[PDB]
Write a protein that binds this DNA or RNA. Structure first.
Length: 113
RNA sequence: GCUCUGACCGAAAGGCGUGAUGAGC
């Protein structure tokens, strides 16, 4: 995954919360995809463990939900407007960014073809 | 120990989304 396309996602995410709705933390993120409410899922690459966020990759591709990998969990942290680093996040409501997001959805899907 | 909740607990230092708090089992 790109670092250029990565800064984009974080941007969307940080604003997405201003209008739409976002879920922060592996626990809520997982339960989000399991309930088909995961528009997009963010995953940090710098996790401790691994065994703590490893299940997500699979669950998304099988739930037909897009997942994006990000460099630092701290970045995913300040994006979510949280104080503690976040290891994973899932946006459940695109909000007033929907369209602006749908484009990002394809850029990732067009990264695995 | 787990389930649900999901942002606070603390005088402070600090400790929490790798899960504060509060239900339950």
């Amino acid at each position: 995954v790109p670092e250029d396309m990565q800064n984009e996602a974080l941007s969307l995410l940080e604003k997405v919360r201003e209008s739409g709705k976002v879920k922060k933390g592996t626990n809520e993120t997982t339960k989000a995809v399991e309930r088909g409410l995961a528009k997009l899922v963010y995953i940090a690459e710098d996790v401790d463990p691994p065994e703590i966020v490893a299940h997500l990759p699979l669950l998304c591709e099988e739930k037909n939900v897009p997942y994006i990998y990000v460099k630092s969990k701290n970045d995913l942290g300040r994006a979510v407007g949280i104080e503690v680093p976040c290891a994973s996040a899932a946006i459940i409501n695109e909000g007033e960014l929907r369209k602006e997001l749908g484009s990002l959805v394809e850029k990732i899907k067009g990264l695995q073809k």
